[PDB]
Every structure is written in C-alpha cells, then in structure tokens.
Design an enzyme around this catalytic site. Structure first.
Site, PDB file in Angstrom:
ATOM      1  N   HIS A  64       0.849  -1.188   0.000  1.00 44.78           N
ATOM      2  CA  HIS A  64       0.000   0.000   0.000  1.00 44.78           C
ATOM      3  C   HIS A  64       0.883   1.235   0.000  1.00 44.78           C
ATOM      4  O   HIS A  64       1.745   1.400   0.865  1.00 44.78           O
ATOM      5  CB  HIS A  64      -0.991  -0.008   1.164  1.00 44.78           C
ATOM      6  N   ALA A  65       0.679   2.075  -1.017  1.00 37.14           N
ATOM      7  CA  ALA A  65       1.433   3.279  -1.338  1.00 37.14           C
ATOM      8  C   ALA A  65       1.663   4.268  -0.188  1.00 37.14           C
ATOM      9  O   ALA A  65       2.806   4.667   0.030  1.00 37.14           O
ATOM     10  CB  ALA A  65       0.777   3.982  -2.503  1.00 37.14           C
ATOM     11  N   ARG A  66       0.593   4.675   0.524  1.00 39.46           N
ATOM     12  CA  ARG A  66       0.646   5.658   1.616  1.00 39.46           C
ATOM     13  C   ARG A  66       1.337   5.186   2.908  1.00 39.46           C
ATOM     14  O   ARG A  66       1.606   6.014   3.780  1.00 39.46           O
ATOM     15  CB  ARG A  66      -0.766   6.169   1.943  1.00 39.46           C
ATOM     16  N   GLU A  67       1.593   3.874   3.046  1.00 40.33           N
ATOM     17  CA  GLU A  67       2.207   3.291   4.249  1.00 40.33           C
ATOM     18  C   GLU A  67       3.740   3.402   4.209  1.00 40.33           C
ATOM     19  O   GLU A  67       4.454   2.398   4.220  1.00 40.33           O
ATOM     20  CB  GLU A  67       1.706   1.849   4.449  1.00 40.33           C
ATOM     21  N   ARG A 122      -3.516   4.544  -2.080  1.00 42.44           N
ATOM     22  CA  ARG A 122      -3.332   3.204  -1.525  1.00 42.44           C
ATOM     23  C   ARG A 122      -3.030   2.128  -2.571  1.00 42.44           C
ATOM     24  O   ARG A 122      -2.090   1.348  -2.407  1.00 42.44           O
ATOM     25  CB  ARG A 122      -4.584   2.837  -0.688  1.00 42.44           C
ATOM     26  N   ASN A 139      -3.324  -6.146  -1.993  1.00 44.37           N
ATOM     27  CA  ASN A 139      -3.656  -7.007  -0.859  1.00 44.37           C
ATOM     28  C   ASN A 139      -5.094  -7.580  -0.904  1.00 44.37           C
ATOM     29  O   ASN A 139      -5.540  -8.183   0.071  1.00 44.37           O
ATOM     30  CB  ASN A 139      -3.363  -6.305   0.469  1.00 44.37           C
ATOM     31  N   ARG A 140      -5.795  -7.419  -2.043  1.00 43.89           N
ATOM     32  CA  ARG A 140      -7.114  -7.999  -2.332  1.00 43.89           C
ATOM     33  C   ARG A 140      -7.042  -8.688  -3.708  1.00 43.89           C
ATOM     34  O   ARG A 140      -8.051  -9.184  -4.212  1.00 43.89           O
ATOM     35  CB  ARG A 140      -8.242  -6.937  -2.341  1.00 43.89           C
ATOM     36  N   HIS A 192       3.197  -3.455   6.714  1.00 41.78           N
ATOM     37  CA  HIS A 192       2.147  -2.472   6.492  1.00 41.78           C
ATOM     38  C   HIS A 192       2.079  -1.484   7.660  1.00 41.78           C
ATOM     39  O   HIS A 192       2.877  -1.565   8.598  1.00 41.78           O
ATOM     40  CB  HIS A 192       0.797  -3.216   6.401  1.00 41.78           C
ATOM     41  N   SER A 193       1.104  -0.559   7.593  1.00 38.07           N
ATOM     42  CA  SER A 193       0.774   0.427   8.622  1.00 38.07           C
ATOM     43  C   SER A 193      -0.704   0.820   8.447  1.00 38.07           C
ATOM     44  O   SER A 193      -1.214   0.701   7.340  1.00 38.07           O
ATOM     45  CB  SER A 193       1.694   1.645   8.538  1.00 38.07           C
ATOM     46  N   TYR A 194      -1.413   1.275   9.494  1.00 38.06           N
ATOM     47  CA  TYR A 194      -0.976   1.431  10.884  1.00 38.06           C
ATOM     48  C   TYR A 194      -1.943   0.605  11.741  1.00 38.06           C
ATOM     49  O   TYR A 194      -2.679  -0.197  11.165  1.00 38.06           O
ATOM     50  CB  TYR A 194      -0.971   2.931  11.275  1.00 38.06           C
ATOM     51  N   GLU A 266       1.430  -4.566  11.080  1.00 39.83           N
ATOM     52  CA  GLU A 266       0.849  -3.230  10.938  1.00 39.83           C
ATOM     53  C   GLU A 266       1.670  -2.393  11.907  1.00 39.83           C
ATOM     54  O   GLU A 266       1.617  -2.633  13.114  1.00 39.83           O
ATOM     55  CB  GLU A 266      -0.644  -3.219  11.310  1.00 39.83           C
TER      56      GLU A 266
HETATM   57  N1  LIG Z   1      -3.689  -9.905   4.497  1.00 34.11           N
HETATM   58  C1  LIG Z   1      -4.447  -9.432   5.638  1.00 34.11           C
HETATM   59  C2  LIG Z   1      -3.958  -8.051   5.994  1.00 34.11           C
HETATM   60  C3  LIG Z   1      -5.065  -7.166   6.497  1.00 34.11           C
HETATM   61  C4  LIG Z   1      -4.611  -5.765   6.870  1.00 34.11           C
HETATM   62  C5  LIG Z   1      -4.326  -4.720   5.788  1.00 34.11           C
HETATM   63  N2  LIG Z   1      -4.346  -3.408   6.439  1.00 34.11           N
HETATM   64  S1  LIG Z   1      -3.987  -1.955   5.837  1.00 34.11           S
HETATM   65  N3  LIG Z   1      -2.377  -1.879   5.842  1.00 34.11           N
HETATM   66  O1  LIG Z   1      -4.443  -0.998   6.785  1.00 34.11           O
HETATM   67  O2  LIG Z   1      -4.456  -1.922   4.496  1.00 34.11           O
HETATM   68  C6  LIG Z   1      -5.352  -4.763   4.667  1.00 34.11           C
HETATM   69  O3  LIG Z   1      -6.495  -4.387   4.819  1.00 34.11           O
HETATM   70  O4  LIG Z   1      -4.872  -5.211   3.534  1.00 34.11           O
HETATM   71 ZN   LIG Z   2      -1.342  -1.953   4.121  1.00 34.13          ZN
END
Ligand SMILES: NCCCC[C@H](NS(N)(=O)=O)C(=O)O
Ligand SMILES: [Zn+2]
Ligand SMILES: [Zn+2]
Ligand SMILES: [Zn+2]
Ligand SMILES: [Zn+2]
Ligand SMILES: [Zn+2]
Length: 305
Positions: A64-67, A122, A139-140, A192-194, A266
């Site tokens: 995710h870009a913003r993290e 993101r 991540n989806r 990842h964050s947060y 996270e």
């Molecule tokens: N693979 C399961 C990871 C779940 C957490 C993750 N959180 S985030 N970094 O806020 O986007 C997300 O929603 O992809």
């Molecule tokens: Zn993330």
C-alpha cells in the site's frame, strides 16, 4: 540523497538498492522480479551469506502506497543486516543459515503517486474498464478466497479486488517469485501500517489455521519482544478475528501454498498521525520492529520444515 531516518522517494530507493548491493556483494544480490503497470522494475534483494540448499524468509514492504513507514522498514532491515553481520551473534547466525528475500517497494507506481500527486493513495496505478477510476488493491488481488466479503467489486473503491486474481503485474510478479522458490521459502512477512498489529491467517474467511496455537504463541512472544524496547503496545491474532475480512491477501495465499509461518505487521501508530507518521519516529519504529522480526526469524530457524 538517501537516509535511513527519512522517507526516500522511489528514485532514491531504486539508487539505494543498486548501491547497497554494490557496497555489500558478499551479503546482497539484486534482481528484478518483474515490472509494474507503468513499467518500473520491481527490485528484490537476496540478503544473506551465499551457500547451498539455504532456507529462506520472504518479506515485502509497500504493498500500500501511503504506508511510508513500511517502505522505510525494509530499508532499515537491510541496514541492520549489513551493519550488524559479524558484529552481533543472532544476525550473523541468521544470514549464515537463512536468506532474506526483501522486496522494498512492491507498489512502486502507487508510491511515486504519493510523492507527486496524492499522499493518501493506496492502490496500484492501473486503468479499469468502463470508468476513469484508477487502481486495484494488491492485498485484495491474490488468489486466496479472491474477491469475497471484505474486498470490493467496485473499481472506485480502496479494497478493489481487480478484474481477476493476479490481474496486477506487481501481484503476479510477487506470486510468481514465491511459486518459483516455494521449496526454500519457510516464512512470509508483509509489512504495512498502521494500528500496531501482528496478524496471521486467515483473513479471507472466518477460520483458524492448522497451526493456530503455534502462530498465536509466536505472535504473542513477537509482540512481547517488540514491547521491551519502548513499551509500544501491539495486539495480535488471526486476521478476520483481530482486524476484519480482507480476502485476496498475500499472507493467506502464501500460507495456502504451504508457507506455515505467515504474518502481516501493521506498524506505528494507533491513529494520532496514521499513515503520515513523522520522520522523527522512523528510528524508534524500525528498531522495535527489528526485535519482533528477529524473534520470528530465530523461531523459524529452530522449527525448519
Ligand atoms: N492480508 C491481511 C492483511 C489485512 C490488513 C491490511 N491493512 S492496511 N495496511 O491498513 O491496508 C489490509 O487491509 O490489507
Ligand atoms: Zn497496508
Ligand atoms: Zn543471544
Ligand atoms: Zn485487533
Ligand atoms: Zn539497530
Ligand atoms: Zn518448538
């Protein structure tokens, strides 16, 4: 100008991947595992002392870009490996016995966009049919309970699953690398964050993994180790249980490929700064995260399969 205590743009990170490899050839090798939608090279660093039939740990940052703290952590991990190898017992043992496949920035295109146009971006930067809405959530986008509840079928949404599983070149490049090196990869770590969490499978459905008790105890201990440095409080558990349904995740996909030890970290903070974590906190966040990562690494070494 590169700095481990500052957020670096892609041009700086890319130049750093080349420089850190050239400055440490006996400990780091660099390869491009594919290209992004905009044609940027997806670099991967193989960190460790070369040897035959070595087990490995895969770690990615910047899905995710913003993290920005996640991108900063992958660089800090490499920083730690080159600085403390031969100087600290555990890191020396880890790099001799294991290899670390460090992907510093997966979503390069999205990361460039956070630096140039939208700090809160993101997703990827790929086009979508029948709309001007851009990007898919990487991540989806993995092939693990793909596009079920917790992922969106709407291309204008932040959790858009994509047109198909692995529709994104970045997702396909990561998945192809892990599939091509399945026999050696013993652990998968996604930074990842947060919200300060250590998550393990499953996130695509409400179900506990085969080794739930083992992963629960390992995450508990990793959380405890992280807290010893500054008292930073982390919560842990299965994804769907501790966070929310997040199908098509790399951690769940890696787990279903046979990678028994799969975690999503996270990082800082709990909401005060969110994704816009100040540079003054990079050092503290990265050093405490190092303790949890090294603990998981030490456990994997003692539980090889
Ligand atoms: N693979 C399961 C990871 C779940 C957490 C993750 N959180 S985030 N970094 O806020 O986007 C997300 O929603 O992809
Ligand atoms: Zn993330
Ligand atoms: Zn010791
Ligand atoms: Zn939680
Ligand atoms: Zn340190
Ligand atoms: Zn044991």
């Amino acid at each position: 100008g590169h700095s481990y205590e500052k957020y670096n743009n892609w041009e700086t990170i890319e130049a750093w991947t080349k420089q850190v490899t050239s400055e440490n050839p006996d400990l780091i090798s660099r390869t491009a595992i594919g290209t992004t939608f905009l044609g940027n090279n997806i670099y991967l660093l193989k960190v460790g002392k070369p040897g035959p039939n070595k087990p490995a740990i895969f770690m990615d940052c910047g899905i995710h870009a913003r993290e920005w703290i996640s991108h900063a952590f992958c660089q800090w991990f490499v920083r730690e490996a080159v600085l403390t190898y031969g100087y600290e017992s555990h890191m020396t043992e880890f790099l001799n016995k294991l290899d670390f496949y460090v992907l510093p920035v997966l979503n390069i295109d999205g990361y460039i966009y956070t630096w140039t146009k939208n700090r809160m971006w993101r997703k990827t930067r790929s086009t979508n049919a029948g709309t001007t809405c851009i990007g898919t959530d990487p991540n989806r986008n993995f092939d693990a309970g793909w596009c079920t509840t917790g992922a969106s079928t709407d291309p204008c949404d932040e959790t858009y699953c994509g047109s198909a599983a692995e529709s994104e070149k970045e997702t396909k490049a990561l998945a192809d690398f892990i599939r091509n090196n399945l026999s050696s990869i013993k652990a998968y770590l996604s930074i990842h964050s947060y919200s300060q969490h250590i998550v393990y499978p499953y996130s695509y459905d409400y179900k506990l993994p085969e080794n739930n008790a083992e992963l629960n105890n390992l995450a508990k201990a990793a959380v405890k180790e992280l807290a010893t440095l500054y008292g930073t409080k982390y919560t842990y558990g299965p994804g769907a249980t501790t966070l929310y349904l997040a199908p098509g995740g790399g951690d769940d996909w890696a787990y279903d490929q046979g990678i028994k030890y799969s975690f999503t970290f996270e990082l800082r903070d709990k909401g005060r700064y969110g994704f816009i974590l100040p540079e003054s906190q990079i050092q503290a966040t990265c050093e405490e995260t190092m303790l949890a990562i090294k603990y998981v690494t030490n456990y994997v070494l003692g539980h090889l399969y």
